[PDB]
């Protein structure tokens, strides 16, 4: 089997991407944030504290003839950005782009933190990291991908995120029309439960490529590109007036600037992030200070190849017995 679903930016900045997901019988369609940096599929629901729901579409398990309470199971997750959610668990039928999994754990939120409430466009998350990170207790649950894998034509999914435009998540096949040139594959460590890999270096604009190993995670659920302070300083030094602002929470730059591109290495291959992808717009409405899309990972504890980086590529998440990651230009 295969599946193919369009993923759409939630706003004009590509702050996140939503993908429609069918849950239950008859189908309830919720727009979920596919997140290769976590491993829980959770949804706003009829059980979510009413004051914490503001415009989201909810899953109502009592209206699904295939829903079953997973007795005694609870979940609770905290994300790198400080947001969180928790609740109980149902199993139900879940379909993405025509690919159906029966008996998928659907984690129903009883509580969500303010950032979730305030984002009316995101009805929940669909985790695509390794199932070892799943938070369900006392019996850990599998991700949608893990459940689907054996049925897929090939044990892979691909992320093809758009810049200010829709893109695609495919399951079970590689669309050879969706990228240019060849796909370069690189090793993955699953030791921390992430799609963790080592970039071979970087360049700023038309500058020379610096060969240096940068360990980090391919994370579709993180908006920005978080890299070591040395790398980030080298980038922003090429933008007149750019500076790190403790008050704002990162590098800002004059909105009048033209940003240079940023290249990262995948083996001997190179992925180029155009400068415009690095612009996250005014820090507040009407400001002439703009927020940068490349930020320091110092004090995160891990480098994160988030959407800023991933949307410059066609990315293969290869879930074979020994997982690997593939990147192609597009």
Swiss-Prot record:
Catalytic reactions on record: Hydrolysis of proteins with specificity similar to that of pepsin A, prefers hydrophobic residues at P1 and P1', but does not cleave 14-Ala-|-Leu-15 in the B chain of insulin or Z-Glu-Tyr. Clots milk
Keywords associated with the record: Aspartyl protease, Disulfide bond, Hydrolase, Protease, Signal, Zymogen
Disulfide bond sites: 255-290
Biological processes annotated in GO: proteolysis
Hydrolase is among the record's keywords: yes
GO molecular function, one term: aspartic-type endopeptidase activity
Protein name: Endothiapepsin
Gene: EAPA
């Amino acid at each position: 089997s295969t599946g193919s679903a369009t993923t759409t930016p939630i706003d004009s900045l590509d702050d996140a991407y939503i993908t429609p997901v069918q849950i239950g019988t008859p189908a309830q369609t919720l727009n979920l944030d596919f997140d290769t940096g976590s491993s829980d599929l959770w949804v706003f629901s009829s059980e979510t504290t009413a004051s914490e729901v503001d415009g989201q579409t909810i899953y109502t398990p009592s209206k699904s003839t295939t829903a079953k309470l997973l007795s005694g199971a609870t979940w609770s997750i905290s994300y790198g950005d400080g947001s969180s959610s928790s609740g109980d668990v149902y199993t139900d039928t879940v379909s993405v782009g025509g690919l159906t999994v029966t008996g998928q754990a659907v984690e129903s939120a009883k509580k969500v933190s303010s950032s979730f409430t305030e984002d009316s466009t995101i009805d929940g998350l669909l985790g695509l990291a390794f199932s070892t990170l799943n938070t369900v207790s006392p019996t850990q649950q599998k991700t949608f991908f893990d459940n689907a894998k054996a049925s897929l034509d090939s044990p892979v999914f691909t992320a093809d995120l758009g810049y200010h435009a829709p893109g695609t998540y495919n399951f079970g096949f590689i669309d050879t029309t969706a990228y240019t040139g060849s796909i370069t594959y690189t090793a993955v460590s699953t030791k921390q439960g992430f799609w963790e890999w080592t970039s071979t270096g970087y360049a700023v604009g038309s500058g020379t490529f610096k060969s240096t190993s940068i360990d980090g995670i391919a994370d579709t659920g993180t908006t920005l590109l978080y890299l070591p302070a040395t790398v980030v300083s080298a980038y922003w030094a090429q933008v007149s007036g750019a500076k790190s602002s403790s008050s704002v929470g990162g590098y800002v730059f004059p909105c009048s600037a033209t940003l240079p591109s940023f290249t990262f290495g995948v083996g001997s291959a190179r992925i180029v992030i155009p400068g415009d992808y690095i612009d996250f717009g005014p820090i507040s409405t009407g400001s002439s200070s703009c927020f940068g899309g490349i930020q320091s990972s110092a004090g995160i504890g891990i480098n994160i190849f988030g959407d800023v980086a991933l949307k410059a590529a066609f990315v293969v998440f290869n879930g074979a017995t020994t997982p690997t990651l593939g990147f192609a230009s597009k």
